């Protein structure tokens, strides 16, 4: 402790200088001779009603037609986004939930919350009912995110400064990712499913390694808590949203910040972030009751999605870019286009 | 109709699900939810028991055919600025303070101020439970307390002669009780804007009428909600 704090600071200064030496041009200037998208206007194609309390999470299905939503009255609902039918309505054991996830195959769903337990439900069962198939426990804090890898592998992110790679068949952690010094709020899987990034309340994001369990990289550009994170479709960049009232883009290869999307009027905090299929549109929910759309290459806002009367919680673009669904705290889902 | 023989059955299934959701909505509306806070020495476990690695605990109790669910966190870290946003649609926040220990009174005052001034808890109304009254009375009447050591402004405080209800108690303890309640109420009324009210109380360990004060304050909260709905207050 005597000289360790000095060596750590010297190494941090070395890292900062190395990052400075590899920044000759800014993305603001290289992407200056690009035609702007003008104005992207979207309209509510569908309005899904039926939740009693605020909506805390949503996840699109892999077929771009089904979706799942989690509410604070203790209900998951699996909709049919084309005809607004209710395919499934699953009651929960603990009514304090902040996350939900759809399996890539479509057989399973997952939900977690304030009871420090991640529950895996089996949809495609005989007897025609949805029953809980696994209750993964072992976290010492509330569960803030969960994302499937296969039908037998799921990555969870909790509020005890940890992430975990589980094994649903046997039901115990196979890997634990540690290194954060605050609540971890969101994670985003890589397209190839070999890495993932995680943002925490200590104003930092970290790029991990699923198979080894190490912490490959650390990004520190924000100045407050981080609420949402998302991968670029290429898999070599990711966007982060904070209570800073700013959004940021980070590069895995250049290992530094690329662009910050902000506006002097906005003083609220970002709650959700998603990308478009081509990566030319960054969508970001907000605390002032309405979403936003940013040109991800030139940092000028080019669209607003104002249809909610309360805080916007969740937001996610579908796989083929058909629609965009945004949930919020007044219990209504809205599929735009 | 332009619907197949199977999409009609899908629609019928959706309608059955909607009917079940309506029943669940009735059941969800009929009940009131409370959030219980407090430190380790506050004795909130005694209040929990007086109502006849898991991250939350829930207890159920009913009075006058009204159902209450009380939640308290049990295994979360001490940061509280991210899992407190979930409790913004609750009826009330029960707050428990140990008033006999003046070493930690400022910490409790800071906790109450931070809860009161919260951005998402800006409509919920607190129900203050000043606990351990017998301990405070004994420690004051036995001397060697010197409340002025921690609060310098207690050397020039006089009891509010207008409102002095006490069923045969020593006049020295009354000054201390009303000083503590005055501190908490001053924090309450410094910035309230008239949207939520603090309801202070005085409780012991063997007190039995703790399930009725909750009911009375909840009824008053509901009445104020109705008055605000009809634009009378």
């Amino acid at each position, epitope marked *: 402790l005597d000289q360790l704090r000095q060596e750590a600071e010297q190494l941090k200064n070395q890292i900062r200088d190395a990052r400075k030496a590899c920044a000759d041009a800014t993305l603001s200037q290289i992407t200056n001779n690009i035609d702007p998208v003008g104005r992207i206007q979207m309209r509510t194609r569908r309005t899904l009603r039926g939740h009693l309390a605020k909506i805390y999470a949503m996840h699109w299905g892999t077929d771009s037609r089904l979706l799942v939503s989690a509410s604070q009255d203790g209900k998951l609902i699996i909709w049919d986004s084309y005809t607004t*039918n209710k395919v499934h309505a699953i009651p929960l054991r603990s009514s304090w939930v902040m996350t939900c996830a759809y399996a890539p195959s479509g057989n399973y769903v997952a939900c977690g919350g304030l009871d420090n337990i991640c529950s895996i439900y089996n949809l495609k069962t005989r*007897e025609g009912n949805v029953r809980v198939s696994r209750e993964l426990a072992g976290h010492t804090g509330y569960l803030s995110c969960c994302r499937f890898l296969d039908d037998n592998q799921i990555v969870t992110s909790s509020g005890d400064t940890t992430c975990a790679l589980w094994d649903i068949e046997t039901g115990q952690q196979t890997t634990t990712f540690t290194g954060h010094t605050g609540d971890v709020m969101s994670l985003s899987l890589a397209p190839d499913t070999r890495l993932f990034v995680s943002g925490a309340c200590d104003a930092s994001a970290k790029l991990w390694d699923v198979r080894e369990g190490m912490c490959r990289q650390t990004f520190t550009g924000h100045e407050s808590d981080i609420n949402a994170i998302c991968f670029f479709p290429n898999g070599n960049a990711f966007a982060t949203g904070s209570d800073d009232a700013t959004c940021r883009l980070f590069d895995l290869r250049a290992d530094q910040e690329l662009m910050t999307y902000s506006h002097d009027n906005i003083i609220c905090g970002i709650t959700s972030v998603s990308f478009s299929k081509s990566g030319r549109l960054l969508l970001a929910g907000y605390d002032d009751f309405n979403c936003n759309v940013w040109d991800a290459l030139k940092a000028d806002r080019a669209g607003v999605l104002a249809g909610h009367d309360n805080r916007v919680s969740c937001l996610g673009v579908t796989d083929d870019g058909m629609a965009v669904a945004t949930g919020s705290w007044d219990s209504f889902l809205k599929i735009w286009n | 109709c332009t619907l*197949s*023989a199977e999409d009609k*059955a899908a629609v019928e299934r959706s309608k059955m699900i909607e009917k079940q959701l309506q029943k669940d909505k009735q059941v969800y509306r009929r009940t009131l939810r409370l959030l219980l806070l407090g430190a380790d020495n506050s004795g909130k476990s005694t209040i929990v028991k007086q109502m006849r690695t898991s991250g939350i605990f829930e207890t159920k109790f009913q009075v006058d055919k009204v159902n209450f669910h009380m939640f308290d966190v049990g295994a979360q870290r001490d940061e509280r600025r991210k899992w407190i946003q979930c409790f913004n649609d609750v009826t009330a926040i029960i707050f428990v303070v140990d008033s006999s220990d003046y070493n930690r009174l400022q910490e409790a005052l800071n906790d109450f101020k931070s809860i009161w001034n919260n951005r998402w808890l800006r409509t919920i109304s607190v129900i203050l439970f000043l606990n351990k009254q017998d301990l405070l009375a004994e420690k004051v009447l036995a001397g060697k307390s010197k409340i002025e050591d921690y609060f310098p402004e207690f050397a020039r405080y006089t009891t509010p002669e207008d409102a002095t209800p006490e069923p045969g108690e020593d006049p020295r303890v009354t000054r201390a009780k009303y000083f503590i309640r005055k501190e908490f109420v001053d924090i309450s009324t410094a910035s309230g804007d008239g949207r939520h009210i603090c309801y202070p109380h005085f409780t012991c360990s063997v007190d039995t009428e703790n399930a009725r004060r909750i009911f009375n304050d909840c009824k008053d909260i509901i009445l104020q909600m109705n008055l605000r709905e009809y634009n009378l207050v």
Partner: single-chain antibody
Amino acid sequence: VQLVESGGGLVQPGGSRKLSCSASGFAFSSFGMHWVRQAPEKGLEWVAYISSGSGTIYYADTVKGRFTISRDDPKNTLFLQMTSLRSEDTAMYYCVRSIYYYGSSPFDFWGQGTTLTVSGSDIVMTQATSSVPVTPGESVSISCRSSKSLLHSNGNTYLYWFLQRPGQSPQLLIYRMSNLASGVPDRFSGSGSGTAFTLTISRLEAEDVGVYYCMQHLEYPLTFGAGTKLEL
């Protein structure tokens, strides 16, 4: 999963009978349920249908206004009450599940029905060939022909393929003309276009000979085929 039926027997003409089916092993209150007939030596024939929650009931025009269907969820049982029994009602009765939502596979589980003996604008489906003698290992293709087009506007082609082995109840193979039912070997396949469908079997084996039926579910009534008895 169990669907055991009770009733049946010999009845003089003009009488009445009540057939029961006691579901046991699944959530009986969330499944629409059908009664389907079968003559002693002819093909299958749809009889009646009752929805989930008893909110929708359909009968075949042969017995419309003479039969009645009624379920009981707390007792987990489903009844058919039939009166004024003619000489064409002598048959074996099966009770069939079906659940309808986006992606479900109706007509999952067929019971083992009961025998009862006595003393227009419909879509006709044609199964021309009625016998295909073939040895194991060959690739076979059965053909079914519809009256009108079965492809709805939403894109789903409502054709179902059922297999009845000698002395056993039918079982679902293909639903909506393309998808494979859960629990059958991957060698079965189904394809075709509107008004002309085919079922392909590759690497034929034992426990595969039987009678193959095609069904349409585009609109009620539900009409079956005639069957193609695959032999050795």
